[PDB]
């Protein structure tokens, strides 16, 4: 409800909206189980023909990356 | 090169050795060349095709053999070194043999004078010049 800032551009608006959902995104990520979340993320992207092996295991502050559309089923 | 003695001193040395060895009638002292020793060492490693590095010191030469050697290489090296040691002993030339894994475990890195190691995408280490 704060009209305290008005937006120069697409990215400024988009980020302002995005940062608002994080109170919900936290709650979903607290209780889902990350291995599913990542599995779905990699699946909606067509990447590397949808599933491929990983030689190396490397965790990339994946907590802030994950889309809500990935989080919901896992929860 | 590394010994400075007179003939008299050498004779005295001879006689004292003869006193330590009551079964020997005399001890013959022979002067050998350091350059010869070092050269035969390096020639043997080339002849065996082993990869190596050489380091020089005021009183010694060190050959460092390190990495992921194959079992044939390890066999050859063990045989050669064992032969050399029995001829020249271990005082002047030393052979350092080290099996070890590939450097930095298969991380990627920037190896200049300002190098660094990637831990993961998004993560830099900057530990030392590489």
Curated annotation (Swiss-Prot), chain A:
Shown segment, full-protein numbering: 76 to 150 of 224
The protein's role, per its UniProt record: Involved in a secretory pathway responsible for the surface presentation of determinants needed for the entry of Salmonella species into mammalian cells.
Highest taxon, organism lineage: Bacteria
Stated family: Belongs to the FliP/MopC/SpaP family.
Encoding gene (name): spaP
Full protein name: Surface presentation of antigens protein SpaP
Localisation: Cell membrane
Curated annotation (Swiss-Prot), chain B:
Superkingdom of origin: Bacteria
Gene of this entry: prgH
SS bond list: none
Protein name in UniProt: Protein PrgH
Organism: Salmonella typhimurium (strain LT2 / SGSC1412 / ATCC 700720)
Subcellular location: Cell membrane
Role according to the record: Required for invasion of epithelial cells.
């Amino acid at each position: 409800e704060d009209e305290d800032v008005t937006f120069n551009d697409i990215s400024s608006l988009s980020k302002h909206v995005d940062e608002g959902l994080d109170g919900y995104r936290d709650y979903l990520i607290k209780y889902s189980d990350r291995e599913l979340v990542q599995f779905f993320e990699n699946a909606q992207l067509k990447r590397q023909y949808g599933e491929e092996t990983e030689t190396v295991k490397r965790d990339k502050d994946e907590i802030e990356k994950p889309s809500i559309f990935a989080l919901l089923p896992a929860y | 090169q590394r010994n400075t003695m007179s003939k008299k001193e050498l004779e005295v040395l001879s006689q004292k050795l003869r006193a330590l060895m009551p079964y020997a009638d005399s001890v013959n002292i022979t002067l050998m060349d350091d350059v010869t020793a070092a050269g035969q060492a390096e020639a043997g490693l080339k002849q065996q095709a082993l990869p190596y590095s050489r380091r020089n010191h005021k009183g010694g030469v060190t050959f460092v053999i390190q990495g992921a050697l194959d079992d044939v290489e390890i066999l050859r090296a063990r045989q050669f070194v064992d032969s050399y040691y029995r001829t020249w002993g271990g005082r002047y030339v030393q052979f350092a043999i080290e099996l070890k894994d590939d450097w930095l475990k298969g991380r990627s890195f920037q190896y200049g004078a300002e190098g660094y190691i990637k831990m993961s995408p998004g993560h830099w280490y900057f530990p030392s010049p590489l």
